[PDB]
């Protein structure tokens, strides 16, 4: 979505790459998130379908997991590396929901960027998510269900 690249500035001289500010950064960060979120969006659920990635030596890898497909996608952008390492943190800890946690984070950065354009501060936005998540975990405790009156290993079978 970003066009017309930022001009090289003579008043601010920093060694290396040029500095860029404003709303273009959060637009570029969300645009970098959609580059990886659209990849994993199709391979979600039973009806979801996956893709192939070649290793430039004839070999390839048909991958369903979010941690594996992002591990081979070496993201040069800094914001994408956070989600790449998150899936490597997700699959090692729990081993489930690797595709959903990236999809949840992508949708959050979408609407969070829309809220910043609506002129509320990110600190109030982060406070809104934390108080909401604290009530969400409290609601997850309410909707629990203890396994009872089940014949044999049926609860372990159907959950697998």
């Amino acid at each position: 979505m970003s066009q017309l690249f930022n001009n090289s500035r003579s008043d601010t001289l920093f060694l290396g790459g040029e500095k860029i500010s404003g709303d273009d950064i959060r637009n570029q960060n969300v645009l970098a998130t959609m580059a990886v979120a659209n990849v994993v969006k199709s391979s979600l659920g039973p009806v979801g379908l996956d893709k192939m990635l070649v290793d430039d030596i004839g070999d390839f890898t048909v991958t369903n997991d979010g941690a594996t497909i992002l591990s081979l996608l070496d993201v040069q952008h800094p914001a994408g590396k956070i989600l790449v390492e998150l899936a490597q943190q997700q699959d090692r800890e729990i081993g489930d929901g690797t595709t959903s946690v990236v999809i949840i984070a992508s949708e959050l950065l979408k609407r969070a960027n829309e809220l910043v354009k609506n002129k509320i501060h990110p600190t109030t936005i982060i406070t809104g998510f934390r108080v909401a998540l604290r009530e969400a975990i409290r609601f997850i405790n309410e909707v629990l269900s203890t396994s009872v009156d089940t014949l044999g290993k049926e609860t372990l079978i159907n959950i697998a």
């Binding site: 950064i25 959060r26 943190q89 946690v101 949840i104 959050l108 969070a112």
Partner: peptide
């Protein structure tokens, strides 16, 4: 899972400017 997605959102959402060397 939402906590990891929350910290993932916080890390990018608080970024204002980008500096590359």
């Amino acid at each position: 899972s939402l906590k990891s997605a929350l910290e993932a959102c916080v890390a990018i959402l608080r970024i204002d400017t980008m500096i590359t060397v």
